[PDB]
Design a protein around this nucleic acid. Structure first.
Lengths: 183, 183
RNA sequence: GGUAAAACAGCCUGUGGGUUGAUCCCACCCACAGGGCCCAUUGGGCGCUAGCACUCUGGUAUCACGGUACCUUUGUGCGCCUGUUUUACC
């Protein structure tokens, strides 16, 4: 099928997992080594359920910009031998707009779901649930709950992580390369 | 988890797929190159639905032994550019008994299912549905339908393909290395 | 012109030489001469902000020592980008 789906299936097979925390079930994306990404509201504790099996969290960083502003991403280091495929090369320096994107989701509510979203525009400031948030990306698609964590993709590019919606629009936290230079 | 579970998950991720034919939904195992294996009761036609994608069948063989006896396996050559991981090294030259096995199934009825089976005994002749059949492997897990095609595994070894059950006992067709010297 | 197909180029510079759409900036080609970089080297390979898949040369972790995960190199199929052809179709 489309080159984006070929890209998207591979990304989900090699780098994604289903995660349960105290606050729900999420798609989770492994960046490299043992570092992965959840939406901030997942609030992962000392251990998580990764594909129905308990895994310890060695470290959890909640991203904010230079000013202290929410970015709606939590990076967590997983206590497991396996390393993720290194997809930092698929992350861009700064926010990415595309004319057509796929949002991929893998949870028990939404198993193997590859949603074509269309135009992704760089949105910037958003008031998520009372919290000033920055580096939002926006796309025009009727979103539901339980989609947070979904990986927004384009052929050869990982744009961000779905972090919320409003009924006709969905919003992803941009996933920037320098977030993972080290941590 | 088990060394066997690590093995089975790897096998399903890299080598299995869900297949629909005119005769139901099946777990399917890729052997190498583009050769795969199904139960004969799948009876694949000129195309199959492989992970919801139409795939053409270049060639299909229903296995018989030198004596002409049913083996309950269909080998099919898939018209795909991508090639399967070569797992012929995990196949034995003759039927294998193990004292501990996992049967792995991936259909919409049975998503991401890894059934611990226990002893696998070499059963030999079976009268499947009125057809003299040979090289049956027998294991005792009161089984249900839609499990045909499940992969019977132990760490480092692929024993066979689930082809039927009886309420108490389950049966796999043994998957021997010389079946694939050239296919 | 489109519109399909095919088919063949792509390391980077200059040195020519033409041609070129045209007489001007080009674009191509035709060649030469340098500089390279990679590999597993009598050799190979080097368009990839577009990737996917297997395979191969080595590593590193881990393991119930059967495997598993990742990195790295070799190749091959599919895809993609530029051209240059050729053929239809309108």
């Amino acid at each position: 099928m489309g080159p984006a789906f070929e890209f998207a299936v591979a990304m989900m097979k090699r780098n994604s997992s289903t995660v349960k925390t105290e606050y729900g079930e999420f798609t989770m994306l492994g960046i490299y080594d043992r570092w992965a990404v959840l939406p901030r509201h997942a609030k992962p504790g000392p251990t998580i359920l990764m594909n129905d099996q308990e895994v310890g969290v060695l470290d959890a960083k909640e991203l904010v910009d230079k000013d202290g502003t929410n970015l709606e991403l939590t990076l967590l280091k997983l206590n497991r031998n396996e390393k993720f495929r290194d997809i930092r090369g698929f992350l861009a320096k700064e926010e990415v707009e595309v004319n057509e994107a796929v949002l991929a989701i893998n949870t028990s509510k939404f198993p193997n779901m590859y949603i074509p979203v269309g135009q992704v525009t760089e949105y910037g400031f958003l008031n998520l649930g009372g919290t000033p948030t920055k580096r939002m990306l926006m796309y025009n698609f009727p979103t539901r709950a339980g989609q947070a964590g979904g990986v927004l993709m384009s052929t050869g590019k990982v744009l961000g992580i779905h972090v919320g919606g409003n009924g006709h629009q969905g919003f992803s936290a941009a996933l920037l390369k320098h977030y993972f230079n080290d941590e």
